């Protein structure tokens, strides 16, 4: 009667699963994505609350037989923040361990099955997070939209707005993103992004999905775009040269893999991240991930049971 539950506070998602000790996964629910650096600490605790309460829900049980949650969020990688995402589980009356680690940690352990590796995330947010054989951890990137997140979707989408509109203001490069980016917002005029960005309540990833523009256009031989996807594989690749360097893996056997919807969807983005690995890391293995992060949350807290 006994399980577990593990939370993948991701950037496009909140993802649950519940899952039995034997690693039988029951049910699994969603919310939206929600980080303590873009929401209010009260939004953030009512996501993650309904979230566990649907999940309890469809199991027809109490968390009094949950033997472990490990939740692995965005935005609370902080000492600090790890007591203030606890807080918040434990406001359910929950009496058993919680395991608040990162979003990486959970995408290393479902991704690999294994405590040493690398991960790169690119989805709303991009940051780089390794174990090395020694058992030591390193990370690169992370900051958030707005002081980070380089080659992440979000980036991406901010950047196909400032090339669309130096297109249309004659600072830049003509771009077919300067009439393909209204097109995907339905707004008539320049001059009406304004209002979207600052006056709409528009979310991290609302912008982040703009990245499905700059490949379109890419795909129709747009040189702005294919510019803004080769940078942003360039960044993702220095995350990961900054990890590897940090961590004494220049000339280790390494396995790597990569989550979001960024790295993992564009062809030519992966490409380049790819090429660039290949050539300066040989060593470095890349894998696509065995399971989802919530199941790698499912591992961390399921490992930690008898
Ligand atoms: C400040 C912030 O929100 N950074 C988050 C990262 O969170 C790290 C753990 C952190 O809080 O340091 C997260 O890993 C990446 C990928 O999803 O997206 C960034 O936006």
Known sequence: MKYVIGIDGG?????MKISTLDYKVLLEVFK???????????????????????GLGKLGQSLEECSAICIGTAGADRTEDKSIIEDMIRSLGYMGKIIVVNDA???????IEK?????????????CYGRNKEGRSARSGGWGHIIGDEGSGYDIGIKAIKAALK??????????????????????????LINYIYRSGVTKKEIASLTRVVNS?????????????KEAARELFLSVKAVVEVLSMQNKKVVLTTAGGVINNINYLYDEFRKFLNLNYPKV??????????????????????
């Open 285 to 306: 293995k890349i894998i696509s991930m065995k399971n989802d992060s919530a199941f790698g949350a499912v591992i961390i807290a399921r490992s930690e049971c008898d």
């Open 167 to 192: 297109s249309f203001d004659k600072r830049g490069e003509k771009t077919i993103l300067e009439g393909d980016i209204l097109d995907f917002l339905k707004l008539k005029s320049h001059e009406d």
């Open 105 to 111: 940690e959970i995408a290393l352990a479902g991704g």
């Open 115 to 127: 405590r040493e590796g690398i991960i790169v995330i690119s989805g709303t947010g991009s940051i």
């Open 11 to 15: 950037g496009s998602k909140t993802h």
């Open 217 to 229: 256009a890419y795909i129709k031989g747009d040189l702005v775009s294919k510019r803004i996807l």
């Open 32 to 54: 939206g994505p929600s980080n303590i650096n873009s929401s209010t600490k009260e939004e953030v605790k009512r996501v993650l609350q309904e979230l566990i309460m649907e």
